[PDB]
Short mmCIF file of all heavy atoms in Angstrom, two decimals:
data_model
loop_
_atom_site.label_atom_id
_atom_site.label_comp_id
_atom_site.label_asym_id
_atom_site.label_seq_id
_atom_site.Cartn_x
_atom_site.Cartn_y
_atom_site.Cartn_z
N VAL P 197 28.42 31.76 9.54
CA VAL P 197 29.62 31.58 8.68
C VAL P 197 29.67 30.28 7.87
O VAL P 197 30.51 30.14 6.96
CB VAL P 197 30.92 31.69 9.50
CG1 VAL P 197 31.06 33.09 10.09
CG2 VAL P 197 30.98 30.66 10.61
N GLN P 198 28.80 29.32 8.18
CA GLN P 198 29.06 27.98 7.70
C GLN P 198 29.18 27.87 6.18
O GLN P 198 28.48 28.53 5.40
CB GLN P 198 28.11 26.92 8.32
CG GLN P 198 26.76 26.73 7.69
CD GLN P 198 26.07 25.51 8.30
OE1 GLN P 198 26.04 24.44 7.71
NE2 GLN P 198 25.54 25.69 9.51
N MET P 199 30.15 27.05 5.80
CA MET P 199 30.65 26.93 4.44
C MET P 199 30.78 25.43 4.18
O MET P 199 31.35 24.72 5.02
CB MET P 199 32.03 27.59 4.37
CG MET P 199 32.67 27.62 3.00
SD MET P 199 32.02 28.96 1.98
CE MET P 199 32.17 28.21 0.36
N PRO P 200 30.30 24.94 3.02
CA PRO P 200 30.28 23.49 2.74
C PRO P 200 31.65 22.81 2.44
O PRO P 200 31.66 21.65 2.03
CB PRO P 200 29.34 23.38 1.52
CG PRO P 200 29.46 24.69 0.84
CD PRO P 200 29.66 25.71 1.93
N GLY P 201 32.76 23.50 2.67
CA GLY P 201 34.09 22.91 2.48
C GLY P 201 34.46 21.96 3.63
O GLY P 201 34.99 22.38 4.66
N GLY P 202 34.17 20.67 3.44
CA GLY P 202 34.48 19.66 4.45
C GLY P 202 33.53 19.69 5.63
O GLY P 202 33.70 18.95 6.58
N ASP P 203 33.18 28.21 8.71
CA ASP P 203 34.45 28.24 9.43
C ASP P 203 34.67 29.60 10.11
O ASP P 203 34.31 30.65 9.54
CB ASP P 203 35.60 27.91 8.49
N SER P 204 35.28 29.58 11.29
CA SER P 204 35.45 30.79 12.13
C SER P 204 36.33 31.89 11.53
O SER P 204 36.25 33.05 11.95
CB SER P 204 36.04 30.41 13.49
OG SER P 204 37.36 29.90 13.36
N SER P 205 37.18 31.53 10.57
CA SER P 205 38.04 32.49 9.88
C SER P 205 37.24 33.65 9.25
O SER P 205 37.76 34.74 9.11
CB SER P 205 38.87 31.78 8.82
N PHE P 206 35.98 33.40 8.87
CA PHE P 206 35.14 34.43 8.25
C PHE P 206 34.38 35.34 9.24
O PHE P 206 33.87 36.39 8.84
CB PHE P 206 34.13 33.79 7.27
CG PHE P 206 34.76 33.14 6.07
CD1 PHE P 206 34.52 31.80 5.79
CD2 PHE P 206 35.57 33.86 5.21
CE1 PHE P 206 35.09 31.19 4.68
CE2 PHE P 206 36.15 33.26 4.10
CZ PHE P 206 35.91 31.93 3.84
N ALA P 207 34.32 34.98 10.52
CA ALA P 207 33.61 35.80 11.50
C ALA P 207 34.09 37.24 11.54
O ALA P 207 33.27 38.17 11.44
CB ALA P 207 33.65 35.16 12.89
N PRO P 208 35.42 37.45 11.66
CA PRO P 208 35.94 38.83 11.65
C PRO P 208 35.55 39.66 10.42
O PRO P 208 35.18 40.84 10.58
CB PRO P 208 37.46 38.63 11.66
CG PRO P 208 37.69 37.29 12.26
CD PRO P 208 36.49 36.46 11.84
N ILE P 209 35.64 39.07 9.22
CA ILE P 209 35.38 39.81 7.99
C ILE P 209 33.90 40.15 7.88
O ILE P 209 33.56 41.26 7.50
CB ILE P 209 35.95 39.12 6.71
CG1 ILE P 209 35.13 37.91 6.24
CG2 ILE P 209 37.38 38.66 6.94
CD1 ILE P 209 34.18 38.21 5.11
N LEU P 210 33.01 39.23 8.24
CA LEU P 210 31.57 39.52 8.19
C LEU P 210 31.17 40.57 9.24
O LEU P 210 30.35 41.45 8.97
CB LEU P 210 30.76 38.24 8.33
CG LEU P 210 30.93 37.26 7.18
CD1 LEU P 210 30.06 36.02 7.35
CD2 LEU P 210 30.61 37.95 5.87
#
Side-chain angles (χ1 to χ4, degrees), chain P residues 197-202 204 206-210:
Chain P
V197 296
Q198 84 172 259
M199 183 81 211
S204 66
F206 294 124
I209 75 99
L210 294 182

